[PDB]
C-alpha cells in the first residue's frame, strides 16, 4: 500500500494512504512523497486526516451517516485549511 507523509508547522509527521490524501487537489499538485505545511499546525492537520478517512468510508453508502464533529476552538483554523486544500 502506498502512503505519503504530511508534515505540520510544528513538525508532526502524519502518514496516510496516498488515495486518501488525493481528496485534496492542492495536495495532488504539491506531490505532482512528503509535503510540508508551514501554516497548518498539528491540532488542525490531524483533523484534516480524520476527514479523509471519514469521506472515503462514507461516500456512496446507504449505512446511515454520522455527523463530522468539529470543536468550536478549532473551527476557524480548520475552515482556512479546508479552503486552501479545496476539500
Amino acid at each position: 500500500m502506498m502512503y505519503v507523509k504530511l508534515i505540520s508547522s510544528d513538525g508532526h509527521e502524519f502518514i496516510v494512504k496516498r488515495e486518501h490524501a488525493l481528496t485534496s487537489g492542492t495536495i495532488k499538485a504539491m506531490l505532482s512523497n512528503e509535503v510540508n505545511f508551514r501554516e497548518i499546525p498539528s491540532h488542525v492537520l490531524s483533523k484534516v486526516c480524520m476527514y479523509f478517512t471519514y469521506k472515503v468510508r462514507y461516500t456512496n453508502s446507504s449505512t446511515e451517516i454520522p455527523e463530522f464533529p468539529i470543536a468550536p476552538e478549532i473551527a476557524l483554523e480548520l475552515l482556512m485549511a479546508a479552503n486552501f486544500l479545496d476539500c
Binding site: 500500500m1 502512503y3 505540520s8 510544528d10 513538525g11 508532526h12 509527521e13 502524519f14 502518514i15 496516510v16 494512504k17 486518501h20 499546525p41 498539528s42 491540532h43 490531524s46 486526516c49 480524520m50 476527514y51 479523509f52 478517512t53 471519514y54 472515503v56 468510508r57 462514507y58 454520522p66 463530522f68 464533529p69 470543536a71 468550536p72 476552538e73 478549532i74 473551527a75 476557524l76 483554523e77
Partner: protein, 104 residues
C-alpha cells in the same frame, strides 16, 4: 468489522485501519511495511498497557464502534535501540488558541 486507528510514536502518527479479528503481531507487520523496523523491535500499547502479539484488536478493546473513521483510537508505539526498548513517548498535538470574542 473494520477498526480505525492512529499509531503514534514521538512526532509520528500513522492513520490506518485493520480488522477487529486481526492480531497485535499482524499490526506490527503493517508498521514494518511503513517505518521499516521489524516486529521484534516494536512494542505496541493501549494507554500504558503493553499488548501481547497473539491477542486480537477486539480483545484489546479496539472495537468498530469505538475506533471510528472520524474519531480513531490511539495505539502507542516504542522502538528498541540496540539492547533495550525506549520508554513510550507520544508528543501532544499543538494547543488551539483562545476563542475569539465573537465566537463566545
Amino acid at each position: 468489522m473494520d477498526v480505525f486507528l492512529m499509531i503514534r510514536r514521538h512526532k509520528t502518527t500513522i492513520f490506518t485501519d485493520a480488522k477487529e479479528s486481526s492480531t497485535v503481531f499482524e499490526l506490527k507487520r503493517i508498521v514494518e511495511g511503513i517505518l521499516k523496523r521489524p516486529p521484534d523491535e516494536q512494542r505496541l500499547y493501549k494507554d500504558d498497557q503493553l499488548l501481547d502479539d497473539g491477542k486480537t484488536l477486539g480483545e484489546c478493546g479496539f472495537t468498530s464502534q469505538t475506533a471510528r473513521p472520524q474519531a480513531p483510537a490511539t495505539v502507542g508505539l516504542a522502538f528498541r535501540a540496540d539492547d533495550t526498548f525506549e520508554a513510550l513517548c507520544i508528543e501532544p498535538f499543538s494547543s488551539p488558541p483562545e476563542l475569539p470574542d465573537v465566537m463566545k
